[PDB]
Symmetry: C2
Subunit: 810 residues, 2 copies
């Protein structure tokens, strides 16, 4: 089943039915002001902090779902309805939602009246603008009433949802002209406030929730909208809201335009008041005047369109597959940029109460968004390193707001330091800017103990070098990339965290996943060592890498696939000797990217085993068989019902690693079939089974052992987007950044006749055309740049701001 | 306006209309299983812990209000309704709700079908029983179907409401017979589960919320109830629920009876499973069999009635005023016992996420329920003492579940140690059991550092002595009883606690309230010292008390009332020199109770000033004038809008102290008029203004400076009940427990002709008849016990389990 279609010309997804299998949302905002908006105009907005500066109120896991947001009511002779079909839920003559890049349009018609609302956050503007067109498409003149409604939050979502015993008496509002100001706690210690404004004269207003709606009425039928006029209520505690009411007369064919603004203002502590008890509204006046006409709103809309076009213009693909073109050209890059903007703060599955992102998550997102924003990527990389500890360890949780690491969560996730090396190498390969290696980064945010960034990478390498186990494999510690594989926990108490509670010293449990990661990233570390002129350091690093590879080949291979780990007892994890979890997905991908077992056939056998035991029509499952009971020696992984999350669920994050491994072994058809199973554009026609947004990646899809097999959870906030974009664009399509330039090495399905990619790389544009006369999967036979044959597979660097034609024959 | 009445014979409050100014709730449970239920059958249940063992889900501050609870649907030929009028909100021929002592009965009828449900938690039973009667009062036979519905919670309210990234995949249920078992995370470190059962054959069931209700439907119209059939859905993640569906034939005049049970079962770790993956239901089986017939439910109901009747039987008043009779005899004692059972965990204003109650709160609550449960009060006192620190200070927050103090919040609330002496003295006065003073009590829960209870009282006394200020007054720390008077905070940044953040050393700011406390409570300590045989210690304590009294008289009196405090700068707080807050309420209450200025007229002047500046028709405000801006040197008190909470709001908690002071000065009419303004039974006819439960006390009523003057907040959970009961029963009616016996000293309005009190005291019952031939307020003329005239005003102790007649003439 399908609930809409893609609009590739306008870069939109069009939802044509209000009742999607789940609310499908979109993100507005780029710098400081952010908004989550659903297809029925539900969601909320905040300023830089969904936890500490939330502006509007939203209820998660509500009955009915997605109840609350920017609500417009059209009242007509006792009838009333909503453009988004919610909250009123009366049948509309026509409904449409369009999710674009940073904007959302919602159109609804009933009784000959059509309402179209465009929501977007303009650039360099701490507010969300909603432009409303009200059109009379009937044959008679009409008198209608337009109602606006938002619900304010008390700036602290946890306090707003738990501390009623104080905050039921603190809500304060102001009403001036057509503007309603929310200024709760502005009198004591807050220098900021919010406002809801319209650019036309209003017939009435409302600011008390119990007066606009009523105690025993829901959003579907407020008492004021039912009665056809506002009550002009001034909020005094309880729940502040903002509502305008405008009386409109429309001739047949006549339309009217309105601009609503939700804005945020910060004042200097000295200039906080205009008079005693009256707030300073100068900044609000300027903000409102900035968009007091439709022309200015249109100009800002066009500027935002240009912004997103420039963001997405750096990688363009022209192939025969429209689904692939739409995935690569628009939605993958858009999701990567949105993940950079939002981290893991707020979604419809993340409540916005969290305190930060993951260190590995921050480093892995850069692999996705590096080619779009190199300077912000450099700044983010330098900020991440400053939090690293002196011994090479890292904080598990990073806080981009304060640019610090969470001390309460702590350390001992032993895979974290390698992601910094991987991200730094990716940035250097993308930009060629080696100068980042010579910058003075502090340790633990301490300027006194500051060293070069290459020193940080050295500490990251030798943290793994020093913490080895009985078999020569890295000690897993608290956990590795798989946060639910806790081999040092042994927890029997229901309420203690699986990731922070440890009862074992951690000197026995190992991990071959971290070993494969070490072998994979040590190549980049050795290259960086060779650049800095340290030949002896490079020799030592190569010796350690070779020792780790030998350890993997001796104590890490089960016999037909790579092992997973060794538990604290010293027994194998992910082995055919076990009764459950005989094979895991994480070790195979990273041990095949590291080129381990490529000559003896171990990698091919491991990939064949992955296909045989982990493959489902909806992707690869994490492990097989699923754990049917609780294993105290394994941690949280077995605490899930079979087929869900880490208990044999489908993580599309580590499916990209299997895709990369399949490209490494030279099987492009298998890699592309693996890619297709999880790509949003290829699973749109099965939307009713997927149940989530058909335009973005989700974190986890139910596995074969589940009875909801095929259903997804935790959309829009994933490292899936970055890794899948990397897999499709660099390993399959074969356009890979490299230290000397741009490497061409595709691995594609044999049936493809070819394709072409337009790539902006280091101050120049390359027009790479790949053709497959003899239908093969891998192997480059000739590259010509600007009409001249070159040697090798690395394109020369020009940095002249021109366009060069590249022809590749396989 | 009025929304119900009192049924004094049946000890109930009857609500006759469902649309009440706010949801009015009641508590079921006595020992471990507890439940909150409103007049529309909304609320939730939990086991000993609203935070860590919540069984059913409830949404606070919802739109519409109070959505979620035990919901019964009656479906009849396409129509459907609810006996509680919610959530369907279809008009009923008749509705009634009776809130009783530990039980709630809701009756509703429509289309000739009447449904009556009685909810109560039986004694020694970890479950809530709902007995349902369905009666056909029409003239034709009918074919109906009955639907049950509750929504389960995942046992961790914070995790349930914030951690959807994991818990959307963890929900698990079983269905067997007529029982639905919720066993989320039972496959793991949890050894407990819940169940919903009915004692009849069911036509169908539902356990998935999206299948019973639908994604875009609310509680008002579930899709299964609309269609008239169940879907037989088995929950797999998302939101587990429990729903039975029974098809019923009804003849005219015929009725059917059903018993629904919400139960909680804990298993041993070695007896968790009947078979692989199948839970052990033997305990659930016997629990269900315990109430499989209406007769057993009726027997348990009668037993609970007897339990509460014995609980409230130790203080009986017979006066001419029925409102006073119902306040003293039923509802004050009931609220005190409920506060003991629930502490401050869960209400409709407390979200149930807190970790404990206040240390002073437990001691102050003990003053109300000591005469009902003397044996549990002794254990409570011993635990509270065991939590105390070596230097005499105490933890601010007590955790009755773990019997520990909250270390993360800390200490330095300098009034906290003084309440322990008051509570211990009250217990000794009530019981005469001095042996508590000789028990070895640990310090900081350390059995090695254990000493006697009298040593704990000595440390509490000398904590104040060693922490005096520049004027000889006690050094206020983080705060005193007034938690919002933070004179050491000086906070400029939001989202940082006003009560734990201190930027000043704390050696200048003093408190006149703690000084009056020290003078009032120290005399009991001197009496205990004399009992223990330490005459020199008593002499030293009396010297310190005299010095404190001199300090109060020299640096604590403003000139027409008592000062409140000295701020950190050393200036007066609560002085006529200040432009705002020239008079507070606490210092006058406690300095007159300690009899500091009764001979020079200072106390009378202070009380006259209190009446002149703080009196409103709805009570007494905290301070006047209200603070209109933020005072950084004062803390959170000025962070409230005027007229709300501590910014000139009405707390009945210190209204009780003002009543006691008015009895001290001998003005009984003023004391009783102060009592009437806040007593629930006297403000019932103004319910629409009060907006909260007209049968229990609330924490705070909006003051004269507020627009909502007269509106209440934070009901059902406060120290208001205990202190108001103490004021009415001991200071006004004059029956006061004392060392060596029972003192008679009433202070009553002159117009009263007299009254009778039946008191159970130390193993005997007294029938005290007070007569007022010459209409006076204070001063007894003679007391005759068993027909013989006695000397003094202390009744002799008999301890013979008999009844003695006491005649008191004023």
């Amino acid at each position: 089943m399908e609930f809409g279609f893609f609009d590739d010309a306008n870069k939109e997804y069009v939802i044509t039915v209000p009742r999607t299998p789940y609310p499908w949302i979109n993100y507005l905002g780029t710098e400081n002001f952010f908004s989550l908006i659903s297809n029925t105009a539900g969601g909320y907005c905040f300023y830089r902090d969904a936890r500490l500066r939330r502006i509007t109120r939203y209820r998660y896991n509500n009955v009915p779902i997605d109840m609350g947001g920017r609500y417009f009511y059209i009242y007509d002779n006792g009838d009333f309805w909503s453009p988004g079909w919610s909250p009123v839920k009366r049948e509309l003559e026509s409904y449409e939602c369009r999710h674009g890049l940073g904007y959302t349009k919602i159109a609804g018609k009933r009784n000959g009246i059509k309402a179209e609302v465009t929501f977007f956050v303009p650039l360099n503007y701490n507010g969300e603008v909603q432009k409303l067109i009200l059109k009379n498409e009937g044959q008679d003149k009409k008198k209608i009433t337009l109602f606006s409604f938002i619900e304010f939050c008390l700036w602290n979502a946890y306090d707003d949802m738990t501390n009623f015993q104080r905050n039921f008496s603190t809500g304060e509002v102001e009403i001036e002209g057509s503007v309603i100001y929310h200024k709760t706690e502005y009198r004591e210690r807050r220098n900021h406030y919010a406002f809801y404004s319209v650019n036309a004269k209003i017939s009435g207003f409302d600011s008390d929730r119990d007066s606009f709606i009523g105690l025993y009425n829901g959003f579907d039928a407020p008492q004021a909208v039912v009665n056809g006029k506002s009550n002009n209520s001034v909020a005094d505690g309880w729940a502040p809201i903002a509502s305008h009411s405008i009386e409109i007369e429309l001739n047949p064919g006549e339309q009217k335009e309105y601009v609503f603004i939700i804005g945020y203002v910060e004042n200097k502590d000295e200039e906080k008041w205009e008079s005693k008890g009256v707030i300073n509204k100068k900044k609000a006046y300027e903000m409102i005047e900035q968009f007091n006409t439709v022309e200015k709103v249109d100009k800002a809309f066009e500027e935002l369109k240009s912004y997103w076009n420039a963001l997405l213009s750096k990688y363009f693909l022209e192939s025969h597959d429209e689904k692939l073109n739409r995935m690569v050209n628009i939605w993958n890059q858009y999701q990567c940029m949105v993940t950079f903007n939002m981290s893991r703060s707020a979604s419809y599955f993340e409540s916005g109460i969290g305190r930060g992102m993951g260190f590995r998550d921050s480093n892995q997102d850069l692999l996705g968004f590096v080619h779009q924003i190199p300077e912000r990527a450099r700044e983010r990389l330098l900020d991440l390193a400053a939090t690293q500890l002196e011994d090479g360890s890292a904080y598990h949780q990073y806080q981009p707001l304060t640019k610090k690491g969470n001390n309460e969560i702590g350390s001992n996730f032993n895979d974290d330091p390698l992601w910094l090396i991987l991200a730094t190498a990716a940035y250097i390969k993308e930009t060629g800017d080696y100068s980042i290696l010579k910058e003075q980064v502090p340790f633990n945010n301490d300027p006194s103990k500051a060293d070069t960034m290459f020193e940080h990478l050295t500490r990251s390498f030798y943290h793994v070098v020093n913490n080895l186990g009985p078999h020569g494999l890295p000690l897993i510690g608290r956990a590795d990339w798989n946060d639910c594989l806790n081999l040092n926990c042994f927890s029997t108490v229901p309420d203690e965290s699986f990731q922070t509670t440890t009862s074992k010293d951690g000197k026995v449990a190992e991990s071959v996943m971290i070993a494969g990661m070490f072998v994979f990233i040590g190549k980049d570390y050795v290259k960086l060592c060779e650049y800095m002129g340290l030949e002896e350091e490079a020799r030592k690093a190569q010796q350690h890498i070779d020792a780790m590879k030998e350890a993997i080949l001796k104590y890490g291979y089960d016999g037909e696939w790579f092992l997973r780990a060794y538990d604290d007892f010293g027994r194998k994890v992910g082995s055919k000797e076990n009764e459950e979890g005989k094979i895991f997905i994480e070790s195979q991908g990273f041990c095949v990217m590291a080129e381990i077992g490529l000559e003896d056939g171990k990698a091919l056998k491991a990939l064949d085993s992955v296909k045989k035991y982990l493959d489902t029509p909806y992707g690869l499952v994490l492990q097989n068989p699923a754990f049917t009971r609780y294993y105290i020696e394994y941690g949280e992984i077995s605490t899930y019902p079979p087929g869900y999350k880490e208990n044999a669920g489908i993580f599309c994050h580590n499916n990209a690693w299997i895709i990369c491994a399949e490209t490494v072994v030279g099987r492009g058809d298998m890699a592309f079939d693996y890619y297709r199973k999880i790509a949003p554009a290829y699973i749109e026609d099965v939307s009713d089974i997927h149940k989530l947004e058909p335009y973005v990646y989700a974190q986890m899809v139910a596995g074969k052992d589940a009875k909801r097999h095929g259903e997804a959870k935790n959309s829009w906030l994933t490292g899936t987007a970055a890794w899948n974009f990397v897999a499709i664009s660099q390993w399959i399509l074969g356009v890979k950044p490299d230290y000397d330039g741009l490497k061409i090495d595709p691995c594609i399905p044999k049936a493809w006749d070819g394709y072409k990619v337009t790539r902006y790389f280091r101050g120049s544009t390359y027009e790479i055309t790949v053709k497959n006369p003899n239908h093969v999967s891998k192997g480059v036979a000739k590259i010509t740049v600007d009409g001249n044959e070159i040697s090798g597979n690395i394109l020369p660097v020009f940095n002249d701001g021109k366009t060069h034609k590249v022809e590749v024959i396989l």
